Amino acid sequence: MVPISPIETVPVKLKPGMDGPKVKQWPLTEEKIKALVEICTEMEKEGKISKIGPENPYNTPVFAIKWRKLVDFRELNKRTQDFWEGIPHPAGLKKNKSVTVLDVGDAYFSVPLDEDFRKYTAFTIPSINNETPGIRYQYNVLPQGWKGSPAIFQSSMTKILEPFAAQNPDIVICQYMDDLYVGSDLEIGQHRTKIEELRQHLLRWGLTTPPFLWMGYELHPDKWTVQPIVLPEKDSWTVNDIQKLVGKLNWASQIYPGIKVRQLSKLLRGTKALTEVIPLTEEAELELAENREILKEPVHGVYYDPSKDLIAEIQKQGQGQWTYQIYQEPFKNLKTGKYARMRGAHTNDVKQLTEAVQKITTESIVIWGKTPKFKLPIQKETWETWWTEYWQATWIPEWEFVNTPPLVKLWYQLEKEPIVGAETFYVDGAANRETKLGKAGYVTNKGRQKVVPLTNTTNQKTELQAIYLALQDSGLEVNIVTDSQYALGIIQAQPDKSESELVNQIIEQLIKKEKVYLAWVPAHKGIGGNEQVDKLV
Amino acid sequence: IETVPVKLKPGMDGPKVKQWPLTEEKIKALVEICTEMEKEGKISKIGPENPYNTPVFAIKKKDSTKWRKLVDFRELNKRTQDFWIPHPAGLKKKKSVTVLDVGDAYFSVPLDEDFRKYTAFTIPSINNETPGIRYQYNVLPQGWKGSPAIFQSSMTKILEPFKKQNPDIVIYQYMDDLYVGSDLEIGQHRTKIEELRQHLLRWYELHPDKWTVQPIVLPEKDSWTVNDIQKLVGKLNWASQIYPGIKVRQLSKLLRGTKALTEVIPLTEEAELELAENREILKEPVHGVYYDPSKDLIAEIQKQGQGQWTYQIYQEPFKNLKTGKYARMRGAHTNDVKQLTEAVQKITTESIVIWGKTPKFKLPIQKETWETWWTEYWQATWIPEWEFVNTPPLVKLWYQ
Ligand SMILES: Cc1cc(/C=C/C#N)cc(C)c1Nc1nc(Nc2ccc(C#N)cc2)nc(OCCCN2CCOCC2)n1
Ligand SMILES: [Mg+2]
């Protein structure tokens, strides 16, 4: 007998203050019992389990389902300590000339459970007609379904495989789920040779045993893709069905370019239900139709070659949607993706471009461990002006301008100094809260004035209204004095788009303007030109 | 040579904190470092039975191309009991202060056996392929709050000859850092610090005197536009939240009517007197401003453009413990985030020198941007706490 290296057990403890599981053994049919006896018999013959006595107060219920024994550890997992813990992405793997598969189903039960914990795994098989004490049993190995079995199994296996990994950089190895997958670029002879070497290495521990379907992916030696996407086709649409649909679309968006999930996700707002028949806007129908039309033909991503540049390129899809491709060489994509704006009040394209860049950066660090070179639809000058003048710190990693409309631009720029020869509009607004009744307006140095009465409004909305008014009635250059910190706060953030239609109209006005100086003063200080008396009434 | 019993605080478990992604070079460097740390018994590989985790990454300090292992202990630190040196309030008064890294020393002392589980950390793998390399500490870890507190006895025992030799030199210790102040001449000071380095061996320079607290100033102009006066009044109205007797009414009275912003307005006598009295008031210090050690320090930072940054340290609003400004060019000009990060570091260092603890920053930046880039520029062994402000403050233009 060649001596086997023992797999060292991992010490396992129960959560503090907790006692091991005690749960009533379920009554069964004579048939099921007859099956369980044979199963547990051959298992005991294989050393997987062992018969125990009454000295063990702990009991775990056991079922039989059609043959197959099922131990329900549900109450043991709640009383068992936390263990330590994210799948790899195909765009991160490398091309493999040959990939060989080996069965590890023999080695799963070769991982021993910590002895002092074994007593907690106890389960009982009821005898015929309940006329005897049920056969008592405990696990000597990691039980299928237990809390810590996956972590401990993969830990032991990793620990085993590590020495024949590090010594063979020309070999790649992975375990899914019951299998061992090896791969290499070596000539077929050298590959088979190394396979044999590994088989022997595992033999030491006493383990004698394309395209691949792996985690919703299809893996080919030369490339990868997603397993086919089935989008349910029904004239009736449920909420859970919207969730499933959106999920599958997101899943498909990592390789298929141009996928848009917004219109379908807009309908999931503030609703927890598994059943409603929810209509769809023509926008949503066209969206799903376009996704069906994109999915009409298959596409493939390639694997990663460290010897080449890593490039990310981004395009504006419109309506808060952005789409990106990541490739080493033109038209051959490592992978693709999308980015949707956060739920804001007011926002602009430059901030969204920034956010997308950061997202892609982090994703790239996860997958390839490095930051890609960016190709962005924004001119160097625009980014310059923006980041120099922005009140917030901002940064983008190395990048270049790619000219692919629509371009990201700055739609307006406020002046740094008051404008000479330009009319000065002192604006204000006020609203009585209980009646919701208010006034908005302005006075100017030239004597120009307005006050507009407003129903169903507030101080903030009137303060915005006043500014809008001053923008409507002024020439291409204008100075505007406001006392509103709210308004100034909104405009100093530089939105090019807003939820509020008022702010939107303001933006349109700013866009039409050649020069706008926006100045602030404190309210109610009697500062000349600022007239509370007009709007307050 | 013997471990002091250490525990957590009542009703708290060990930290389980997600490890963020690292680049290929940072991972390689951390592997090269932890390998040797493992051969030296400083750390040890652990198993799946350890649920906890603490983040880790790698930095580079000044004048060194060699990487350093940085563990982010903030969570574990706040889960430790502490309460085991009253701050040296003369350290900020010295002509010069030098910062030395004594972290290495901590590895000469063992950590309590039961506590080691809570120092667990993970070298991540690229693309989630292999599980990470997991370690736990054996000796005293750098960045942990318990390390200086526990090693403190040995530190006092080491520095006795130097301290008693010249009792003009102030010595302070914060985390892995040792701050040594002196009033001597910079050459003789540097040679004295060299002497201290050799003295420590057998077992960055500051000038806190070059700083004071910044006053609020008002313009001196020979002619005022309406705009100039509107700004002046805004600023004074802001200052009135700080100082008692500020009065804007004559200055406002200059503006009555509705006028063009660029129009020059001559100051009346009442207005000039009022402005004078306001200057006088702004000269005096702020009233009833005191440091309460039981309260958090708060740092606010504003980007002034063109490489300039203003900041304030306080505890209660409109009571400022310190105010400052930074133009420094370290090669960060094309990068806002590097400037912000250097700024946060500097401000933190000043905060440590003065009050002995770090403040909690409020940064002019988005969470996602900062979080993506700040480790690239970080040269310090400690990590402060920070929030993010997404709505532009008006105080910016009043601190410039
Ligand atoms: C073998 C294997 C099988 C499956 C699923 C099977 C089922 N069911 C899943 C994985 C994840 C792996 N493991 C693997 N596969 C590849 N390539 C590859 C090529 C072709 C085909 C086909 N046909 C399949 C796979 N490359 C690597 O690793 C290289 C990364 C090197 N670096 C190190 C530095 O940081 C960055 C990564 N690992
Ligand atoms: Mg108002």
Does A169 lie in the same domain as A133? no
Binding residues of A for Mg(2+): 103, 178-179, 428, 463, 483, 534
Long-range contacts: B156-160, Cβ < 8 Å, 24+? B158/B200, B158/B203
Token output for A438 = 């208010």
Which-ligand-closest: CA of B21?
A: 1
Task: Write phi, then psi, for A164 (nearest 5 degrees).
Answer: -100, 75
Q: Give CA separation, B91 vs B58, B98, B210, B346, in Å.
A: 30, 11, 13, 16
Alpha carbon distance B398, B246 (integer Å): 15
Tally: H helices and E strands in chain B: 11, 16
Pocket flag, ligand 1, residue A216 (CB < 6 Å)? no
Does A253 lie in the same domain as A386? no
Among candidate residues B306, B313, B359, the one with its CA nearest the CA of residue B336: B306
Nearest Cα residue to atom 8 of ligand 1: A214
Alpha carbon distance A307, A298 (integer Å): 28
Does A169 lie in the same domain as A142? no
Does A7 lie in the same domain as A141? yes
For A127-193, give the DSSP string: -GGG-SPPEEEEESB--TT-SSHHHHHHHHHHHHHSHHHHT-TT-EEEE-SSEEEEEESS-HHHHHH
Q: Is B333 exposed, middle or buried (0-12, 13-18, 19+ CB in 10 A)?
A: exposed
**What 3-state DSSP class applies to A347?**
strand
Nearest Cα residue to atom 35 of ligand 1: B126
Residues of A in contact with B49 (CB under 8 A): 10-13, 81, 83-84, 148
Partners of A49 in beta bridges: A139
Residue for token pair 């009833």: B288
Instruction: For residue A94, report the distance from its CA to the centre of ligand 1, in Å.
Output: 6
Q: Look at strands A135-139 and A123-125 and give their pairing.
A: antiparallel
Segments making up each domain of chain B, as ranges: 5-89+115-155, 90-114+156-205, 206-291, 292-400
Decide if B391 and A86 are in contact by the 8 Å CB cutoff.
no
**Bond before B167 cis per omega within 30 degrees:** no
Give Cβ neighbours of residue A307 (< 8 Å, ≥ 6 apart). none
Alpha carbon distance A468, A484 (integer Å): 13
Residue for token pair 């793997």: A93
Pocket flag, ligand 1, residue A172 (CB < 6 Å)? yes
Among candidate residues A226, A195, A229, the one with its CA nearest the CA of residue A211: A226
Q: How many CB atoms lie within 10 A of CB B12?
A: 12
* Cβ contact A409:A349 at 8 Å: yes
Does A216 lie in the same domain as A285? yes
* Cβ contact A217:A227 at 8 Å: yes
Pocket flag, ligand 1, residue A512 (CB < 6 Å)? no
* B171 half-sphere exposure, CB direction, 13 A CA radius: 16
Among candidate residues B202, B50, B82, B225, the one with its CA nearest the CA of residue B147: B82
Decide if B131 and A155 are in contact by the 8 Å CB cutoff.
yes
Q: Give CA separation, A409 vs A5, A346, A377, A530, B269, in Å.
A: 66, 16, 9, 34, 50
Helix (H) or strand (E) holding B338: helix B336-355
Q: Helix crossing, B367-377 with B336-355: angle to 10°?
A: 70
* Cβ contact A427:A467 at 8 Å: yes
Token output for A520 = 């602030």
Among candidate residues B139, B117, B137, B119, the one with its CA nearest the CA of residue B50: B117
For B215-230, give the DSSP string: PP-----SSEEHHHHH
Among candidate residues A304, A334, A325, A360, the one with its CA nearest the CA of residue A93: A304
Does A4 lie in the same domain as A141? yes
Decide if B258 and A529 are in contact by the 8 Å CB cutoff.
yes
Among candidate residues B252, B248, B274, B246, the one with its CA nearest the CA of residue B265: B252
* Cβ contact A184:A190 at 8 Å: yes
**What 3-state DSSP class applies to A367?**
helix
Residue for token pair 């002092």: A116
Query: Which chain A residue lies closest to B21 (C-alpha atoms)?
Result: A366
Alpha carbon distance B338, B307 (integer Å): 11
Instruction: For residue A462, report the distance from its CA to the centre of ligand 2, in Å.
Output: 8
* B120 half-sphere exposure, CB direction, 13 A CA radius: 23
Partners of A450 in beta bridges: A442
What single DSSP character describes residue A60?
B
Residue A184 CA to its chain's centroid (Å): 32
Q: Is A495 exposed, middle or buried (0-12, 13-18, 19+ CB in 10 A)?
A: buried
Residue for token pair 């004594």: B102
Looking from the CA of residue B129, the nearest atom of ligand 1 is: 11
Helix (H) or strand (E) holding A339: strand A332-340
Decide if B128 and A445 are in contact by the 8 Å CB cutoff.
no
Task: Write phi, then psi, for A202 (nearest 5 degrees).
Answer: -75, -35
Closest chain B C-alpha to A395 CA, distance in angstroms: 6
Partners of B291 in beta bridges: none
Alpha carbon distance A259, A337 (integer Å): 8
Which-ligand-closest: CA of A95?
A: 1
Decide if B369 and A93 are in contact by the 8 Å CB cutoff.
no
First-last CA distance in chain A: 102
Decide if B259 and A529 are in contact by the 8 Å CB cutoff.
yes
What single DSSP character describes residue B58?
E
Does A140 lie in the same domain as A19? yes
Which residue out of A93, A173, A191 has the highest number of ligand 1 atoms within 8 Å of its CB and is therefore the one to mutate?
A93
Of A89, A369, A527, the CB nearest to B27: A369
Q: Which approach determined this entry?
A: X-ray
For A1-55, give the DSSP string: -PPPPPPPPPP--BPTT----B-PPPP--HHHHHHHHHHHHHHHHTTSEEE--TT
Query: Which chain A residue lies closest to B48 (C-alpha atoms)?
Result: A84
Total domain count for chain A?
5
Nearest Cα residue to atom 15 of ligand 1: A93
Decide if A155 and B48 are in contact by the 8 Å CB cutoff.
yes
Does A127 lie in the same domain as A26? yes
Alpha carbon distance A326, A133 (integer Å): 65
Instruction: For residue B73, report the distance from its CA to the centre of ligand 1, in Å.
Output: 34
* Cβ contact A251:A229 at 8 Å: yes
Does A118 lie in the same domain as A78? yes
Alpha carbon distance A435, A215 (integer Å): 60
Breaks in chain A (C–N > 2.5 Å) following residue = 66, 85, 209
Decide if B127 and A479 are in contact by the 8 Å CB cutoff.
no
Give Cβ neighbours of residue A29 (< 8 Å, ≥ 6 apart). none
Largest CA distance in chain A: 108
Q: Give CA separation, A347 vs A320, A466, A495, B224, in Å.
A: 9, 22, 5, 37
Output the CA angle A164-A166-A169, nearest 5 degrees: 100
Q: How many CB pairs under 8 A join A and B?
A: 180
Decide if A525 and B233 are in contact by the 8 Å CB cutoff.
yes
Q: How many CB atoms lie within 10 A of CB A402?
A: 14
Helix (H) or strand (E) holding B206: strand B205-206
Residue for token pair 């139709």: A289
Alpha carbon distance B89, B53 (integer Å): 37
Alpha carbon distance A289, A285 (integer Å): 6
Instruction: For residue B55, report the distance from its CA to the centre of ligand 2, in Å.
Output: 49
Pocket flag, ligand 1, residue A97 (CB < 6 Å)? no
Alpha carbon distance A339, A341 (integer Å): 7
Cα dihedral sign, A282-A283-A288-A290? positive
Closest chain A C-alpha to B111 CA, distance in angstroms: 21
Pocket flag, ligand 1, residue A212 (CB < 6 Å)? yes
**What 3-state DSSP class applies to A400?**
strand
Q: Look at strands B205-206 and B96-101 and give their pairing.
A: antiparallel
Of B126, B254, B372, the CB nearest to A369: B126
Task: Write phi, then psi, for B222 (nearest 5 degrees).
Answer: -90, -15
Token output for A35 = 């099956």
First-last CA distance in chain B: 54
Residues of B in contact with A418 (CB under 8 A): 225, 227, 261-262
Instruction: For residue A6, report the distance from its CA to the centre of ligand 1, in Å.
Output: 29
Of A83, A87, A493, the CB nearest to B49: A83
Q: Residues for chain A: how many in total?
A: 537
Alpha carbon distance B272, B278 (integer Å): 10
* Cβ contact B313:A364 at 8 Å: no
Among candidate residues B392, B400, B381, the one with its CA nearest the CA of residue B77: B381
Among candidate residues A173, A171, A185, the one with its CA nearest the CA of residue A97: A185
Looking from the CA of residue A183, the nearest atom of ligand 1 is: 1
Residues of A in contact with B271 (CB under 8 A): none
Q: Is B205 exposed, middle or buried (0-12, 13-18, 19+ CB in 10 A)?
A: exposed
Does A196 lie in the same domain as A260? no
For A466-505, give the DSSP string: HHHHHHHTS-SEEEEEE--HHHHHHHTT--SEESSHHHHH
Breaks in chain B (C–N > 2.5 Å) following residue = 84, 203
Alpha carbon distance A338, A249 (integer Å): 11
**What 3-state DSSP class applies to B239?**
helix
Alpha carbon distance A192, A415 (integer Å): 72
Domain closes at, from A411, A437, A472: A411
For A205-266, give the DSSP string: TT-----EEETTEEE-SS-EEEPPP-----SS--HHHHHHHHHHHHHHTTTSTT---HHHHG
Pocket flag, ligand 1, residue A96 (CB < 6 Å)? yes
**What 3-state DSSP class applies to A374?**
strand
* Cβ contact B301:B364 at 8 Å: yes
Residues of B in contact with A84 (CB under 8 A): 47-51, 53, 134
A135-139 sheet: strands from edge to edge: A49-51, A135-139, A123-125
Alpha carbon distance B293, A450 (integer Å): 55
Rg (CA), chain B: 25
Token output for B147 = 């390390």
Helix (H) or strand (E) holding A100: strand A98-103
Give Cβ neighbours of residue A251 (< 8 Å, ≥ 6 apart). A216, A226, A229
Largest CA distance in chain B: 81
Q: What is the domain range of residue A237? A: 211-304
What single DSSP character describes residue B139?
B
Among candidate residues A237, A290, A240, A230, the one with its CA nearest the CA of residue A260: A290
Output the CA angle B3-B7-B12, nearest 5 degrees: 160
Q: Residues for chain B: how many in total?
A: 400
Output the CA angle A421-A424-A428, nearest 5 degrees: 170
Alpha carbon distance A408, A355 (integer Å): 14
Give Cβ neighbours of residue B52 (< 8 Å, ≥ 6 apart). B14, B15, B16, B117, B118, B120
Does A255 lie in the same domain as A188? no
Residues of B in contact with A371 (CB under 8 A): 23
Output the CA angle B258-B264-B270, nearest 5 degrees: 85
Alpha carbon distance A487, A523 (integer Å): 13
* Cβ contact A479:A519 at 8 Å: yes
What single DSSP character describes residue B53?
B
* Cβ contact A340:B353 at 8 Å: no
Alpha carbon distance A75, B57 (integer Å): 39
Does A141 lie in the same domain as A165? no
* Cβ contact A339:A259 at 8 Å: no
* A449 half-sphere exposure, CB direction, 13 A CA radius: 9
Alpha carbon distance B164, A322 (integer Å): 67
Looking from the CA of residue B24, the nearest atom of ligand 1 is: 35
Q: Helix crossing, A501-512 with A459-472: angle to 10°?
A: 20
* Cβ contact A377:A396 at 8 Å: no
Output the CA angle A47-A49-A52, nearest 5 degrees: 125
Residues of A in contact with B303 (CB under 8 A): 391-393
Decide if B396 and A155 are in contact by the 8 Å CB cutoff.
no
* Cβ contact A124:A26 at 8 Å: no
